[PDB]
């Protein structure tokens, strides 16, 4: 690693969906390192089909 050439780093914390605490490094873009929590927001998308629309409409 060349000196005087790379950005400063920062230690932050990751919390997974089960509560496990992990320390990772990050480019220093905040004043202090912060704890970040990860949710279950997998965000699956469902579209109602034509037959399903017909069944919910006229049955």
């Amino acid at each position: 690693m060349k000196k005087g050439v790379h950005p400063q780093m920062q230690w932050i914390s990751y919390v997974t969906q089960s509560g496990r605490l992990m320390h990772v490094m990050m480019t220093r873009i905040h004043h202090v390192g912060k704890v970040y929590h990860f949710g279950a927001k997998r965000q699956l998308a469902q579209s109602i089909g034509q037959i399903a629309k017909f069944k919910r409409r006229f049955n």
Partner: protein, 211 residues
């Protein structure tokens, strides 16, 4: 002639937490972080003020990490998959294995005697199914045995026939509790405790099991 192959299962729960590192490794990593910061570019305060100027307080919820020492560790609670989180646990069942040294129960692994099945992995899966009930939270590792033992009769037990015992590996996937049946008693023990449970087979299991 020589027949009755035995397939054993080394049922495994991996480490839940990372073990404590060597203090010199931690000291060097912390020094390496602090030393390289002197020669790295320090972003101005105005760029950090993009986050600081909207660093907004909330109703607030403080996070408390779970301790690495559990109540099962404090109570020495065996049959529990929640103790010795930095180590690995192994399942022993208490009953009668294939060997006929006596009619008294002894600690052992889940075995089954091979009869006609296409693979020994099928026999190990049947042996594990006969103990835990279902293979929903189990993961077998490899079609090959990890080790084997050839048991030959000696000058003091000429009644026991010759046979080979093959060990297969299986991992606990996500279940912290299992319904253990077809046995009298069971434990979840580390490598050192399993070596203490098996004082006569410790020289083989010290090599079969990586600490």
């Amino acid at each position: 002639s020589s027949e009755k192959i035995v397939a054993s299962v080394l049922f495994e729960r991996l480490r839940v937490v990372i073990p404590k590192p060597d203090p010199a490794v931690y000291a060097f990593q912390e020094f390496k972080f602090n030393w390289q910061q002197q020669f790295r570019r320090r972003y101005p305060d105005e760029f950090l003020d993009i986050a600081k100027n909207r660093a907004k307080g909330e109703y607030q919820m403080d996070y408390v990490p779970a301790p690495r020492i559990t109540e099962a560790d404090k109570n020495n609670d065996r049959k529990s998959l929640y103790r010795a989180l930095d180590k690995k646990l192994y399942l022993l069942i208490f009953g009668k294995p294939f060997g006929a040294t006596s009619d008294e129960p002894v600690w052992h692994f889940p075995e089954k005697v091979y009869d006609s099945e296409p693979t020994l992995r099928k026999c190990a899966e049947s042996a594990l199914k006969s103990v835990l009930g279902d293979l929903t939270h189990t993961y077998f590792v490899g079609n090959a045995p990890m080790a084997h033992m050839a048991i030959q009769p000696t000058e003091e037990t000429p009644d026991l026939p010759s046979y080979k015992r093959f060990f297969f590996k299986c991992s606990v996937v996500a279940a912290s509790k299992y319904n253990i049946s077809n046995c009298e008693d069971f434990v979840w023990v580390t490598k050192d405790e399993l070596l203490e449970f098996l004082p006569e087979q410790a020289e083989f299991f010290n090599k079969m099991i990586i600490s």
